[PDB]
Design a protein around this ligand. Structure first.
Ligand SMILES: Nc1ncnc2c1ncn2[C@@H]1O[C@H](COP(=O)(O)OP(=O)(O)CP(=O)(O)O)[C@@H](O)[C@H]1O
Ligand SMILES: Nc1ncnc2c1ncn2[C@@H]1O[C@H](COP(=O)(O)OP(=O)(O)CP(=O)(O)O)[C@@H](O)[C@H]1O
Ligand SMILES: [Mg+2]
Ligand SMILES: [Mg+2]
Ligand SMILES: [Mg+2]
Ligand SMILES: [Mg+2]
Lengths: 280, 280
């Protein structure tokens, strides 16, 4: 595995901790301006029974994070141990766990206000807008893949399936075979393609998970019959305690025709518009 | 999915239970001779966040089990619900759980005798011998994939990666990419092939797991560093309280040259001798 001095971190300065596969850890001087300060981080590494694909996925994940760059709503890559030893991808520790658990925790913890839910959505849109601008497709957008920091900042995570928009085996039968079906854009399966508009479809599902406070999509419908239903025009109903406007946004994301779905840019504008009104 | 009468089972006769993905369940009349008799079984079905590949694997697993036929040391297929609903693959319920959990729970403070261990290995060899005569390659042999019945009968399970000997794409970079590295034969990755002798290498690691009472293979050695070490002749050490003879058997399974490894038949005959001589 190539040596990338820019991101390399000393193994001796990293102390593995409890489980969060991902484990918590203490990294000394991970923050270069504080050479002697120990920081609590999260480390992703291979499981003892890992496969070859698990290895290339982890490497790919690391590289995608390097390419993407830093952003307020994207879990931060801090460093990596790639030489003489097991691969460790060191990222920022999110003390509140993943979004899905966070939301169910405060179901009617401190309950979520309508505005909170909107802010949450807004923050995620911003991250995907930036992500999309960096020519990256996530492919695994879901509440379970969103982390929430101590200050309740939303952070898109788990880049285990992310790709560069240009690195996709267009039309091959084996493409997009590992994406959770219920968060998947129809074209991703039927035509074996994946564009930024495919990610917005998933964003739609994510919006539904958020406003239902971590609910499970297409409740009662097995993945086996989901695609026949999606093909017939079936869409999830509006979450209670959710605005008609917001649900319309969700539906927009789920337009059968990819190019008829809004862009992340347009989504951010509309959400910001709504957020400003709700907080005024 | 195509209708397959001989194997179909009525959904209204099955009552799903707790988790064991797999769950326990009661199947009324699954035993044709006992039409009103309810039987405790196991059911494998897709998770709510399953991928397309998960579905093809479940289907593949089911078909492999139909083709293999019944055998004493192989988890037996009982039936399946493949129509108008989520796919359920019904298999016999093994009350003692998987072999790995089984051995660990019986470590020195119901301990395992040396004969029990040899007996376990022998049974598994017989199962693999049969499988090979059916032109089947399991590809995922390991203690976590062996189930033990109420009468301590060993049963090879989880045919989620199994293939007909001819259904392997030799030389392709994508072949064998989903096999746990620590139980995988070098030719599997290096040459991108898979034969019964590749399963023998796996059986060897399984032997080590058994004699270490559920221990983890290559302890302290990361997966990304294993193959380099194997090429250099590294091999796990003899498990404590393991005879040099059984250890030599393990070592023979780990020969770098596939044809220098014993065949499952040779393993069965040797284990039969050792087991018999221990008994007397
Ligand atoms: N930086 C971090 N801070 C806090 N918790 C984290 C974390 N990274 C991961 N986790 C926890 O671990 C869970 C799994 O993380 P992640 O989604 O990256 O897993 P993974 O890629 O290893 C497996 P899978 O693809 O099946 O989810 C998260 O949902 C969260 O609970
Ligand atoms: N017939 C059965 N009776 C009892 N327990 C069973 C069982 N089938 C499965 N289990 C339990 O469930 C565990 C996982 O089963 P299995 O190996 O089939 O997993 P899986 O294919 O769903 C996922 P993976 O490939 O990650 O293991 C077993 O190790 C065992 O503890
Ligand atoms: Mg995840
Ligand atoms: Mg992942
Ligand atoms: Mg298994
Ligand atoms: Mg499996």
């Amino acid at each position: 595995l190539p040596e990338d001095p820019k991101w390399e971190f000393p193994r001796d300065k990293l102390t593995l901790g409890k489980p969060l596969q991902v484990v918590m850890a203490e990294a000394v001087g991970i923050d270069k301006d504080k050479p002697k300060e120990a920081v609590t981080v999260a480390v992703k590494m291979l499981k003892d029974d890992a496969t070859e694909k698990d290895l290339s996925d982890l490497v790919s994940e690391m590289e995608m994070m390097k390419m993407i760059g830093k952003h307020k709503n994207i879990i931060t890559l801090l460093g990596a141990c790639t030489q003489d030893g097991p691969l460790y991808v060191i990222v920022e520790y999110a003390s509140k766990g993943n979004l899905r658990e966070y939301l169910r925790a405060r179901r009617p913890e401190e309950q979520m206000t309508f505005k909170d839910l909107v802010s949450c959505t807004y923050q995620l849109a911003r991250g995907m807008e930036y992500l999309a601008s960096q020519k990256c497709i996530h492919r695994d957008l879901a509440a379970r893949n969103v982390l929430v920091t101590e200050n309740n900042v939303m952070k898109i995570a788990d880049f285990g399936l992310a790709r560069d928009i240009n690195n996709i085996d267009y039309y091959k039968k084996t493409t997009n075979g590992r994406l959770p079906v219920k968060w998947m854009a129809p074209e991703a399966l039927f035509d074996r393609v994946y564009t930024h508009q495919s990610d917005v479809w998933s964003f739609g599902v994510l919006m539904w998970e958020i406003f239902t406070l971590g609910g499970s999509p297409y409740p009662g419908i097995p993945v086996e019959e989901l695609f026949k239903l999606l093909k017939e025009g079936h869409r999830m109903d509006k979450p209670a305690n959710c605005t008609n406007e917001l649900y319309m946004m969700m539906r927009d994301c789920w337009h059968a025709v990819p190019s008829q779905r809004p862009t992340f840019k347009q989504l951010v504008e509309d959400l910001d518009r709504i957020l400003t009104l709700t907080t005024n």
